């Protein structure tokens, strides 16, 4: 899990 904040992220 976990939120990805950045380019080309989930």
């Amino acid at each position, epitope marked *: *899990k*976990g*939120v*990805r*904040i*950045g*380019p*080309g*992220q989930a």
Partner: antibody
Amino acid sequence: EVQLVESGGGLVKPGGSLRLTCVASGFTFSDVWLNWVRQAPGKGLEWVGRIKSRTDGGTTDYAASVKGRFTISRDDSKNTLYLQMNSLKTEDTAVYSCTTDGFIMIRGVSEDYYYYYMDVWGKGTTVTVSS
Amino acid sequence: QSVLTQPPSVSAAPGQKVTISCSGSSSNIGNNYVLWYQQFPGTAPKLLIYGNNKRPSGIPDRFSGSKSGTSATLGITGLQTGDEADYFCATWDSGLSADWVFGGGTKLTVLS
């Protein structure tokens, strides 16, 4: 002792090719995404492209200004990142640096948030495309 | 010519405050999160702000960031001669290649 060291820069004729190398050390290479960025004299930084980690597919993305001419690849067993440049143009002249995508993790009351950013930066290698 | 536009330079005396603007579009600053970097000569860029306004551990609250519409701002109060350096904003593009994009950079001079 976290670092990136690039080499391979040099003088090349327009239409020529050149391959740059970036050696990593001090951290688990295979676990991170890497970028190639460049900066021409007296100008702003420009992202060249990225290559994802094996776990995320190991795929590549390229800036519109270089796609089709530049190829990025990695060799996790050698902690090495490569940038193969073909059909070089004078406007490709610049200092080329490799960087990793790192992150700041925040533990939320529910989910963990990962904010990515260019973390480690090499000192760069200079590429001059001119006749 | 930089994707994100920043004033070339800014200055103020020690103890004063300054703001450094970063102008972009909907496709970069508008849709995504802003980062700010501090860079000294011959040294790698250092993360000052991430997520528009978050400070990494080690960065004192004199440094602050904010984002509004298609622009972002870096504020620095209580100027220290040690702050004289280059500052640049960064975020990513919403395009097909999701490019990291950068501001041209602003040189902060702490009047000495």
